[PDB]
Ligand binder design. Structure first.
Ligand SMILES: O=C1NS(=O)(=O)c2ccccc21
Ligand SMILES: [Hg+2]
Ligand SMILES: [Zn+2]
Ligand SMILES: [Zn+2]
Length: 256
C-alpha cells in the first residue's frame, strides 16, 4: 500500500520493491559542474503536433493525462535515444510549498514541481513489454517554478475539480502538450528508473534545463487534489515526490 506518508513513503518502498536500492534509481541530483557536454548526442526531436489525449485520471498518487498510443503520433526521438518513443501519458510531482516538489534536483535545488512526459520504445510493441527492457522508456522531465501563469496548463488545472479523489477520471480530449514545453530543449540525460513503484530500471531520462513558470494559483489547485477516495478522510495530494537517489556508476551528460 505504497504512498508518500510516514508509514508508506519512499523510505519504505524497498520492502516490497527491493530494486528501490538498485544501481540505476531515479531521481538523482544533477550536479551541473560534473555533468559533461556530449557532442555525440543527436538533436532532440519532440513531435507532439498529432498528439491526441483521451482522459485524465486521479490514481491516488498523481493525476495522469493519458494519450491514444495505438498509432504513431506524439513521438520523442533523437538526443540520446535510438529509435522512436511514443507518448502514453504525462503527470506531475509537486510540493506542499513552493520550496519543494520536484524529484530531480539541480545543484540540490528543489523546484516547485516536475512534469513527466512518459514514452515507450516502439520496438517493443507495447508499454508492458517495453518495461522489461533496459531501454524501454524515455521520460522527458520538465521543471516548474512559481511565477507567471502557463496558459497551456490552465485546461488541466480547470478539470482537477472533477477528479478530486482516487479513482475518479474525466474525459480530456484535444489537450495539446506542446503548451507545457519551455523555449529551449537544452537537457541533461542519464539512465535511470521509474520514480514510483515498481521502480523499474527501464528509463532514459531527458531533463530539460529551462523550467516552465506556472502561477501560484495554478499549483495551489494541484494541492487541492486528494490521495484518498471519495467519502474518505481528506488527505491532500501534496509532496508526491521521491527524493534524490544515489548516482552510483552513472554519468549525467549535457546536451549543451
Ligand atoms: O510516476 C511516475 N514517474 S515516472 O515518469 O518515472 C513514471 C514512468 C512510468 C510510470 C509511472 C511513472
Ligand atoms: Hg527495465
Ligand atoms: Zn497510487
Ligand atoms: Zn513521474
Amino acid at each position: 500500500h505504497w504512498g508518500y506518508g510516514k508509514h508508506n513513503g519512499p523510505e519504505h518502498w524497498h520492502k516490497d520493491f527491493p530494486i528501490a536500492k538498485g544501481e540505476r534509481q531515479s531521481p538523482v541530483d544533477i550536479d551541473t559542474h560534473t555533468a559533461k557536454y556530449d557532442p555525440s548526442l543527436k538533436p532532440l526531436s519532440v513531435s507532439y503536433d498529432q498528439a491526441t489525449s483521451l482522459r485524465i485520471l486521479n490514481n491516488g498518487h498523481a493525476f495522469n493525462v493519458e494519450f491514444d498510443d495505438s498509432q504513431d503520433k506524439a513521438v520523442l526521438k533523437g538526443g540520446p535515444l535510438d529509435g522512436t518513443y511514443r507518448l502514453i501519458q504525462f503527470h506531475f510531482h509537486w510540493g506542499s510549498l513552493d520550496g519543494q516538489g520536484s524529484e530531480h534536483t539541480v545543484d540540490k535545488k528543489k523546484y516547485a514541481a516536475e512534469l513527466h512526459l512518459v514514452h515507450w520504445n516502439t520496438k517493443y510493441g507495447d508499454f508492458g513489454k517495453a518495461v522489461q527492457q533496459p531501454d524501454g522508456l524515455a521520460v522527458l522531465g520538465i521543471f516548474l517554478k512559481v511565477g507567471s501563469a502557463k496558459p497551456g496548463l490552465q485546461k488541466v488545472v480547470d478539470v482537477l475539480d472533477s477528479i478530486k479523489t482516487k479513482g475518479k477520471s474525466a474525459d480530456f480530449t484535444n489537450f495539446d502538450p506542446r503548451g507545457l514545453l519551455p523555449e529551449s530543449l537544452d537537457y541533461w540525460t542519464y539512465p535511470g528508473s521509474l520514480t514510483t513503484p515498481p521502480l523499474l530500471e527501464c528509463v532514459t531520462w531527458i531533463v530539460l534545463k529551462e523550467p516552465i513558470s506556472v502561477s501560484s494559483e495554478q499549483v495551489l489547485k494541484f494541492r487541492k487534489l486528494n490521495f484518498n477516495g471519495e467519502g474518505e478522510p481528506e488527505e491532500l495530494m501534496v509532496d508526491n515526490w521521491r527524493p534524490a537517489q544515489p548516482l552510483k556508476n552513472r554519468q549525467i551528460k549535457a546536451s549543451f
